[PDB]
Curated annotation (Swiss-Prot), chain C:
<keyword id="KW-0479">Metal-binding</keyword>
<keyword id="KW-1104">Inhibition of host RNA polymerase II by virus</keyword>
<dbReference type="GO" id="GO:0046872">
    <property type="term" value="F:metal ion binding"/>
</dbReference>
<keyword id="KW-0597">Phosphoprotein</keyword>
<keyword id="KW-1035">Host cytoplasm</keyword>
<dbReference type="GO" id="GO:0039657">
    <property type="term" value="P:symbiont-mediated suppression of host gene expression"/>
</dbReference>
<dbReference type="GO" id="GO:0039694">
    <property type="term" value="P:viral RNA genome replication"/>
</dbReference>
From Swiss-Prot, chain D:
<keyword id="KW-1048">Host nucleus</keyword>
<keyword id="KW-1157">Cap snatching</keyword>
<dbReference type="GO" id="GO:0044423">
    <property type="term" value="C:virion component"/>
</dbReference>
<keyword id="KW-1113">Inhibition of host RLR pathway by virus</keyword>
<dbReference type="GO" id="GO:0006370">
    <property type="term" value="P:7-methylguanosine mRNA capping"/>
</dbReference>
<keyword id="KW-1262">Eukaryotic host gene expression shutoff by virus</keyword>
<dbReference type="GO" id="GO:0039657">
    <property type="term" value="P:symbiont-mediated suppression of host gene expression"/>
</dbReference>
From Swiss-Prot, chain E:
<dbReference type="GO" id="GO:0003968">
    <property type="term" value="F:RNA-directed RNA polymerase activity"/>
</dbReference>
<dbReference type="GO" id="GO:0039694">
    <property type="term" value="P:viral RNA genome replication"/>
</dbReference>
<comment type="function">
    <text>RNA-dependent RNA polymerase which is responsible for replication and transcription of virus RNA segments. The transcription of viral mRNAs occurs by a unique mechanism called cap-snatching. 5' methylated caps of cellular mRNAs are cleaved after 10-13 nucleotides by PA. In turn, these short capped RNAs are used as primers by PB1 for transcription of viral mRNAs. During virus replication, PB1 initiates RNA synthesis and copy vRNA into complementary RNA (cRNA) which in turn serves as a template for the production of more vRNAs.</text>
</comment>
<keyword id="KW-0547">Nucleotide-binding</keyword>
<dbReference type="InterPro" id="IPR001407">
    <property type="entry name" value="RNA_pol_PB1_influenza"/>
</dbReference>
<feature type="region of interest" description="Disordered">
    <location>
        <begin position="50"/>
        <end position="82"/>
    </location>
</feature>
<dbReference type="Pfam" id="PF00602">
    <property type="entry name" value="Flu_PB1"/>
</dbReference>
Amino acid sequence: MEDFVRQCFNPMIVELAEKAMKEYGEDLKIETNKFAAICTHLEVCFMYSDFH
Amino acid sequence: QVQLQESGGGMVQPGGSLRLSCLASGFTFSNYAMTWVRQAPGKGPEWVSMVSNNGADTTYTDSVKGRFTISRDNAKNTLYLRMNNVKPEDSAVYYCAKRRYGGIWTGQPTDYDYLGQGTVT
Amino acid sequence: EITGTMRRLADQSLPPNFSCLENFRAYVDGFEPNGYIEGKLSQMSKEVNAKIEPFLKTTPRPIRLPDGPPCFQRSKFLLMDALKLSIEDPSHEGEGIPLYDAIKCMRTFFGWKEPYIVKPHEKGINPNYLLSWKQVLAELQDIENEEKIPRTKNMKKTSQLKWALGEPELRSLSSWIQNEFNKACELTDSTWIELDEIGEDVAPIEYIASMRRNYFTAEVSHCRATEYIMKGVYINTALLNASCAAMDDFQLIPMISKCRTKEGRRKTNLYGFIIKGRSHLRNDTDVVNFVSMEFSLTDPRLEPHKWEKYCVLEIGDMLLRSAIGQMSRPMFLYVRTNGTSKIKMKWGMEMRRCLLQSLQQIESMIEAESSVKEKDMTKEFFENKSETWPIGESPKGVEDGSIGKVCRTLLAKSVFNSLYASPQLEGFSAESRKLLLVVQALRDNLEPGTFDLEGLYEAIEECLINDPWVLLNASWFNSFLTHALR
Amino acid sequence: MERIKELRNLMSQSRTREILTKTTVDHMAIIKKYTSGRQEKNPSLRMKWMMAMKYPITADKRITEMVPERNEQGQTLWSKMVMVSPLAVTWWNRNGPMTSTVHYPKVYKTYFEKVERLKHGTFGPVHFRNQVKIRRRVDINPGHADLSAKEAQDVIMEVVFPNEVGARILLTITKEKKEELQDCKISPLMVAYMLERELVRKTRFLPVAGGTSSVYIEVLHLTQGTCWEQMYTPGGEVRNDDVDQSLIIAARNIVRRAAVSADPLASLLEMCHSTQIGGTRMVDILRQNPTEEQAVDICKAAMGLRISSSFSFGGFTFKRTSGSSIKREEELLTGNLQTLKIRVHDGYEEFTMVGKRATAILRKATRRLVQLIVSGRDEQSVAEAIIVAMVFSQEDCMIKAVRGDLNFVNRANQRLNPMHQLLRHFQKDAKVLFQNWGIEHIDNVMGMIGVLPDMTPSTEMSMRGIRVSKMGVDEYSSTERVVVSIDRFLRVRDQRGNVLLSPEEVSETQGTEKWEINGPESVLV
Amino acid sequence: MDVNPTLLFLKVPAQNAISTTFPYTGDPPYSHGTGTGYTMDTVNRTHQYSEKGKWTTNTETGAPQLNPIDGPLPEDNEPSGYAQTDCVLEAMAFLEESHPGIFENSCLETMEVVQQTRVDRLTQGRQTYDWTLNRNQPAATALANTIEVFRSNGLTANESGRLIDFLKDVMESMDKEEMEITKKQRVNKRSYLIRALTLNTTPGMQIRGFVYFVETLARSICEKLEQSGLPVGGNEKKAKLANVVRKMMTNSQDTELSFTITGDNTKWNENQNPRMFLAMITYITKNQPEWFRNVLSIAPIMFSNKMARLIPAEMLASIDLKYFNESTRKKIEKIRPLLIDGTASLSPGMMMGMFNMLSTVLGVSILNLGQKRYTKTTYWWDGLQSSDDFALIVNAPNHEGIQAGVDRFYRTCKLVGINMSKKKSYINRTGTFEFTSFFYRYGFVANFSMELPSFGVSGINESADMSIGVTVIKNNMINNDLGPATAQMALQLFIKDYRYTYRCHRGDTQIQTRRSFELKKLWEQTRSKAGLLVSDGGPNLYNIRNLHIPEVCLKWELMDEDYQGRLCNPLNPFYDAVATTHSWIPQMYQKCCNLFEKFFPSSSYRRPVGISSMVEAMVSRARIDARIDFESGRIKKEEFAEIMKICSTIEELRRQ
């Protein structure tokens, strides 16, 4: 799961989600689905806001 | 040097047996397949049998199946041929020869070396 | 989740100190490697210990052997005493109909005396066997009254045949199993093998592989154990192939083998007949009964205990050649009742492994002992008759033999292990490998030792009851320990 | 209309209508594996019983107008009810529809490749020997252009079933295969199996005794055995043993250039993005290539990828076998009266170091070397291995053997860490520590010899605590994957406090490639 | 003269020829092919190794259970199933201290497995036990029975496909009072509990997933331990034996004495207590999320309260003690109060072939406790562990303390439930020993699984069978190592079998089966003879050099051009397969799957991806195919209209 998430995304969104996960003691090793959901959220926001 | 001296032949009566031996010297024996090729007086030669290096793949003519048994012993580098139920038409001069390649079926039966002798009944 | 009616099992699975498994989980969360082991050791009794008993050449005592009645023969078919009925026919083995081959076997022998019962079963209806034999001969000669030849004769549901199909004690070692194995190790006149061709001989190892396997075949082809393997193959194959289509009626299956004498002519041999019961084989453990009637020339009156499961019928007289002309020795018929199943036949239709198992367990020896070589010692294994192998002890002394004797000896060992296959032999082999390894480590002088050697002796004596093959191996092992400077 | 009619007469029964309704497509594979599972009744014996029967083979209905009913000898090979006798095969095999379908050797190329390797596969002598197993990690596929399984089965779906291709709608082999075998299809499923067998790589751990390439492994039954060996060169070579080398060279050069950069991380990433390797892009290759090399691992770490616990030192990648550690900083005096602060590895530790041309197993105590088993190829190679081993040993013995000022500099004129300074000093002249290490008596057992300071093997004498293995040390490449913590200067730590790797040990082979490093013509263009 | 083959060991040592001692290649007739009484002996022996007054009547099954864990210490040397809890936890903690956080990486891999695992990984296995019929059935059959009987009730969580949802269904199932099985009407909650914990010879249907998870964790553990060489097969064990030798004997300044024991643990598998496994799993699941500990803790609790499936056995409750012999009477006496409702109760038990890898983990722990750091003494040991057959090497500076180290090993083994067999064990000096049929004498021989394959045909096809035979020969030549000449003999034996099975001998011999005429005419009309397939009466040129090439490609060069054009023609009516591909003559899920595959060919090759229902995809595919073969292709408009009317009939039908 984790390697695939790190595969299909740019390292900037990966770094953003990794820092945003150290916020509430939510360890990313266990909440990997939360990792995928947050990365999806950030890329959705970015591709939503781009070129406008 | 490569020489093939054969023996064991002689006169026999029809319906009997014979054990032809062929001694080869001068080359690596266990590597090459061997052949018995006979020639009747008046008719060109015809291959009698082709035997492998392992001694497991053997092939005879369409008219000698069941009557013959070809084999070889790698220790003394020698070739044995057992002929049983000698028909009158098997009366020809038999020849021991060393195949071009180490195979049996790769290429049609032809040889590239010398010869010894062969008896007639 | 782990809710009630399940946590109730979780709460009952803890060691006898807690009630809620959460207490145990919190106790596991905090653990202290303080050295509880040393306290537990000082608390445990000093008698709980692995006391090493030394192992010198004085410790091994010969194996205890059972005493009592002599062990008889339980093999499925006769090995050495059965004799062949040759036809020397080049039939091309074109699925040669196995029944008519047997009737032209019978066409080759004359001199059938009146069936004279000689040795009874010592328990049960003995004359039913000879009545069944008369029925056999009748239904054999009652084919010419049929407008159509059947390829397989379905025997009538006669009461004697119904009875023949059924519709531990400590037995001491006997003297004959060694002789059976010896005649299995002897050389014969025939070949018994159709070893199919193999491709060209490319250089590196296929030359070596050839000069190994063809040497082994030439030293093994004419062995009697090869005949035994082919015999078992043919009998079990015919039995199985009949057990499908003859699911209701008794079929007559000839014990036929094929070979080639040194004159190089195909020969068909007959050992006897076998009457099959019903073959409603639902599972692989389903039992099908059978009756074996095998020809022979060995009188049971010589060794009567061997034929305990047998009823013997003096069945005729044949021409017999000997060192002095003809002798005309009597021809006997051994009849026994037994049972087999699908697995019992398939282990016996795959008997050719006994060659492979031989070759590799020869080839194994040709690798390890030859691994210590820059250029491997492969031809020096053979062609050096000075190197002898110890295989026999007749005159209170080691009688070493040549190499082919060893090859055929290992082949016959595998053959008898397959035919006399018994879980007792399995256990004995498993438990004797250990003592052999200990003795071998002592031979290299590596100061070995055990804990309970008497326990191993107990375990070995627990699996020595009645099988003659196991007991022969046990006496062999005792003689081996005797001649190992021990 | 047959399929949809089956659907209709199937959807009327309720207990199947419900399951066709609820379960989705994603899960068909989880419902395909629901079988009765009993037809395992001696397949050889049932096969023989059916072959003994008349006409056991079942074919289609087009043989009625294709083969005759009775052959040249009146043999029956048909039926009616459609059973077929096996002799019918041999008839159609003799004189039937002869076709130019000899086009075959393009879909089955993966086998004729082996055939051709056997043709000019010159053989050699059999120097028998006690062959010892080398636990190596090798690939088992020849000539596949290094394509991963997912993108390869995507190419499969593209080339064999275009009307149901996958949903990724954002690649030259696709063109080649769709072009050359367009209308000459044989059996779609078997074609897909053949191309998935040809194009997909797979590298795993195998015990080998000298085989490196893919061609040297597919014939392992001829080369290796219990106690034998055959020198066999299959007169050829493949792409998948000299393609990953191009990526290795690219990573080496990229790191060597980024070490000079003011921002090594951003410059290295901008180079990796703007680099092409044989028609491809570097980022996807690094995401999917399982090649193990320091620079490659640095590039992977630059994008936050898990890699091994590699305790890389001097080009030798280390793997921990057992033992813990504690930092416990400590001061030390040199052999030239120089203070050095150092991270004294306390506790008991066990390591296995895998190198380029040599490997070893080490058991080491706090600043004391207990046991070390080494094996290499060249005399100087095992010498370098023993040098880096002694450097990592941290004993006081090697501390005393330091002679001269310790000023060794990076390409950017930087202070190297003390350990690497010692190693770089010892790598040029190490003859000071050998005669100052210590000699001991050994027993010359089990092909384990000792070495002398004068580059000489010895039977009963060796250096203190050393063992030289015959015919190779067993390698172990343990699989461990953990997240990395890259900094701006290309030094990676394992997030717990271990510096994993650094560029100070990258360069040994300037491979000739089988952004101003190419010719000035390339700078202009 | 008289013949004795074993005497051969006087000229050649044992390890050079130990393969002769192995009597059988395949399997002999099993003496216990039946039998309900020897199981009683197993039960009573298991309860004999645990008699320490720790009886507790279960709260939900009423079956008495023994709790001999951390019970009284043994006073006798005989096998005893009393292992102290603190000893087990201390050994596990010391393993973790020797390998930092290895358990956590193994747990991460186990979490990845439990996340990705569908229910298919529950079908890959041998025969299973269906509790629905109280009978042994194949895996998928019992699985589908359980699925249908759960769908009959209100348990439909496995519809997602993840095995964890099937486990959730299993959990919810044990809580229901009534269990109606499909005129059929069946048992209550209590009998359901009894069947759910019932084992045979063979795990229940529910426990298989949980045992798979525990074994995946044990696999991730054993892969990362050098001293545990169980998951590997073949030469890997060779290397793992050749390494530890140099790890022990090669000690500089040689005063050390290195002894090696080849041991075995008698009836060890019956002494491993499931509660101790619960404890060691709980310690392995330290600080992990609670749900994961709860998932992995299922199987040991099920084995703590587990029932053993045994005139039927169920009538053994109501009988007088005269109808049996003395020995059988005593054996039944000691089991009467334990059995309930025709099911035996076995608390401290564990069945052979369940936790072999976790047991190996425990053994490797008790092995690593001797690296001279946890012994605090001179002697130090290291070894290789299997399920029961372990091998140990202990090094000590003097021959006086080596027995003390052996005693430490045996005592600590007794402390963790490892009863070392004083019979099936022997010590010697380092350089010659045994480990799970692997033998070492300064060299190697690999007769572990040397049960050479089925020499005969595998029986599926003509080319598939030949390729299978030669490939298995090559595999046994590299994997289960055999010699080359033996490979030649086995190959020609298989070729003989394949020729006599398929009525294809050759066109060079005169022997004639039901087929040889056509083969010989084929030989006569062929020019270059070597190219002929064996199925087509050709010479066998397969040897060790070409044991890997499929038959077609090797002979492909040597065939005749007409032969090639007539052989491989895919427009034929019948590894590499050609027109000589027989497909010989030989209902809920597979029917749907086959119809789906007929709709989508890719479904037979790659696992499909799609959220729509099966019917919704099939209807659209049918409609599009109808459109395309109507417009560009050729089809009658009426057939199209009937296709779409049936499709709309389904559209109205899938809504009800």
